[PDB]
């Protein structure tokens, strides 16, 4: 089994008050079953879409989860991932510099 890599980032450089897309890219995992929530201030965002399940040359799977969002100075965003390799869900915070 292979545990997911997780990156949380925006489609465009973040600018407060300007609509954007919040991305959670999960990759490098096996087996393929996985659960992902996007969070706003700790609460699940309901309107989340995802890409079609694909896999890399090393057979590990990858998926993009995404939602439209308008970042602000104080709103906190994160991605929460569950996978059989994880004893508890893994939360990765959005850092607009990464």
């Amino acid at each position: 089994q292979r545990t997911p890599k997780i990156q949380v980032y925006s489609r465009h450089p973040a600018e407060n008050g300007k609509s954007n897309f919040l991305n959670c890219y999960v990759s490098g995992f096996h087996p393929s079953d996985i659960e992902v929530d996007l969070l706003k201030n700790g609460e699940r965002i309901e309107k989340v879409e995802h890409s079609d399940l694909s896999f890399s040359k090393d057979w590990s799977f990858y998926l993009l989860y995404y939602t439209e969002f308008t970042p602000t100075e104080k709103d906190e965003y994160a991605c929460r991932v569950n996978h059989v390799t994880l004893s508890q869900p893994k939360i990765v915070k959005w850092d607009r510099d990464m």
Binding site: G28, D52, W59, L64
Partner: protein, 276 residues
Amino acid sequence: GSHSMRYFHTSVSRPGRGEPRFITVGYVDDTLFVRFDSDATSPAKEPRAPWIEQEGPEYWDRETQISKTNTQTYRESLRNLRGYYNQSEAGSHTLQSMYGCDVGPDGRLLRGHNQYAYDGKDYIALNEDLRSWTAADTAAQITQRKWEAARVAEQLRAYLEGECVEWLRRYLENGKETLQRADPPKTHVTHHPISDHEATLRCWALGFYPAEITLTWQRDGEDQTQDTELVETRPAGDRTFQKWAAVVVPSGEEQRYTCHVQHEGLPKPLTLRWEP
């Protein structure tokens, strides 16, 4: 200049929760253009790029029939694989395969591919000669002997050298405004103090297509491979990709560091520095 077409098959068993799910996606280079999911309400091959939409009903009928047949083939394969490894009917297992062709700028075949993995481990692969097989273990040798007896490799060779190359060339022409357009990275360097003693320099590449890119930091002209944090290239969601590379540098030494970017869409490779 070079291009690839690849189809990706996944079948996942789920005892107690129905029959094994079958998924296919197809790519040209880094562009997903078709998908199939047996768990969909009305499973069919579906377009995912505009330039495949013009294919007519006969195309979609054939593609959907192939995927529906494959759903059953892969369920039989999963049953056989469980037996080959003396496994219980209670466990979940995964069968994956990927196949297709690579062509050069003149549209000629560079090489073909067809390989398989079971529970994430390489199982059997068609060799580059498109005539012989490499089996990972004594279970895959059973598959190999079966496929040798039935001359499967000759069917794959005919497909890979013929239809695969010809239809890839068709797709590249029909989608030439995107598939044959390299979008260069937009690049910049950011500076992030860590402490009084050190800061991070981060070199950004944004908005590029295809995904292949080289991003490196140099210190005094020497590559900083061991000291560079390199994130995996990641999709932006608008067909393009993003990547960054970062180095931790002593305060005041920023101008010893240069970031170097190579990408198909760039007229010339870029050299960047921190510009306060």
